[PDB]
Amino acid sequence: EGTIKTSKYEIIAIFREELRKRTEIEIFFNNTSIITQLTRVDFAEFHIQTHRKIPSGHKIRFLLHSDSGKIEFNAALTKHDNSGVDKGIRYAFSLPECLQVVQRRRDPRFRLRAEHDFYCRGRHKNGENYLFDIKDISDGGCALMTKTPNLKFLSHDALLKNAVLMLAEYGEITIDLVVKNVIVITLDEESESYYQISCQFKFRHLDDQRRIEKILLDLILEAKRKK
């Protein structure tokens, strides 16, 4: 997909459904990117808080992880305050007059939490084991986690054969995964960083694809219920 938003109204309406929803905002600068949240939004500014530092005087790049899809834009630092014995800096930016929304997924990706000890586990070709945490999951694949991948066997379109989804109370399914990307991700003592592996399912049998559909359905049901 592809769509551009200009309306001053849509923009702040969007910056508030995402403040309220406490959704992740990723900021680009130096060389890496930092993930965090909005803390304030008004008629001209939005605020975030990080203990890092950012190139004043320059339109830096932002990106919102929204349920509506990827929302990209560029804004310029306007203010910055310094406080606390534990240094947490307060940056105030300007509202972009231009956004961009991209949503190319024909399947909603369910996000895993504390009550979900989901793992993916296997053995590479060299005979070494891996064990990834599952971060999210859909009918067509999953986004994995690890601090110590073997970057070698995780080449674009490389495939983890005879992997085994360990889905806890749902049991274990044996699948093939196709690696679509490998990325490093950073959150913020606790300044974090792990590798996200983007995976596409390659089903061994067909019941496999159905059993996952039913499972993911049961996760979405406990999602709306429970809380």
Ligand X SMILES: Nc1nc2c(ncn2[C@@H]2O[C@@H]3COP(=O)(O)O[C@H]4[C@@H](O)[C@H](n5cnc6c(=O)[nH]c(N)nc65)O[C@@H]4COP(=O)(O)O[C@H]3[C@H]2O)c(=O)[nH]1
Binding mask 121-140 for ligand X (x = CB under 6 A): ---------------xxx-x
Q: Is 207 annotated as a binding residue?
A: no
Kindly state whether residue 196 participates in binding ligand X, applying the rule CB under 6 A.
yes
Please, what sign has the CA dihedral across residues 13, 19, 25, 27? positive
Q: Is 109 annotated as a binding residue?
A: yes
Alpha-carbon distances, residue 172 vs 101, 149, 156, 166, 167 (angstroms): 36, 22, 26, 5, 6
Please, what sign has the CA dihedral across residues 84, 89, 94, 96? negative
Kindly write down the DSSP assignment for every residue of 120-159, as one continuous string: EEEE-TTS-EEEEEEEEE-SSEEEEEESS--GGG--TT-E
Query: Which of 51-59, 91-99, 176-184, 208-216 is the region at the interface with ligand X (rule: CB under 6 A)?
Result: 176-184
The set of residues, in sequence order, having a beta carbon less than 8 Å from that of 185 and lying 6+ positions away, is 33, 35, 193, 194, 195, 196
Q: Which is nearer to ligand X, 86 or 106 (CB)?
A: 106
Question: Least CB distance from residue 194 to ligand X, whole Å?
Answer: 12
Q: Which is nearer to ligand X, 52 or 109 (CB)?
A: 109
Q: Under rule CB under 6 A, how many of the chain's residues touch ligand X?
A: 25
Kindly state whether residue 95 participates in binding ligand X, applying the rule CB under 6 A.
no
Reduced DSSP (H G I as helix, E B as strand, rest coil) percent helix, strand, coil of the chain, to 5: 15, 45, 35
Q: Which is nearer to ligand X, 54 or 64 (CB)?
A: 64
The set of residues, in sequence order, having a beta carbon less than 8 Å from that of 215 and lying 6+ positions away, is 167, 170
Q: Which of 82, 84, 104, 189 binds ligand X (CB under 6 A)?
A: 104
Q: Which two tokens stand for residue 160?
A: 């983890």
Beta-bridge partner residues of 121: 131, 164
Q: Is 123 annotated as a binding residue?
A: no
**Subset of residues 197 to 216 that bind ligand X, contact rule: CB under 6 A:** 198-200
Q: Which two tokens stand for residue 137?
A: 């999951």
Q: Which is nearer to ligand X, 3 or 56 (CB)?
A: 3
**Subset of residues 47 to 76 that bind ligand X, contact rule: CB under 6 A:** 63, 65, 69-70
Alpha-carbon distances, residue 126 vs 129, 150, 153 (angstroms): 9, 11, 10
Query: Which of 112-120, 146-154, 160-168, 195-203 is the region at the interface with ligand X (rule: CB under 6 A)?
Result: 195-203
Q: Which two tokens stand for residue 123?
A: 């053995």
Kindly state whether residue 103 participates in binding ligand X, applying the rule CB under 6 A.
yes
Would you list which residues are annotated within the binding site for 3',3'-c-di-GMP?
65, 104-106, 109, 136, 138, 141, 181, 196, 198-199
Residue ranges binding ligand X (CB under 6 A): 63, 65, 69-70, 102-107, 109, 136-138, 140-143, 180-181, 183, 196, 198-200
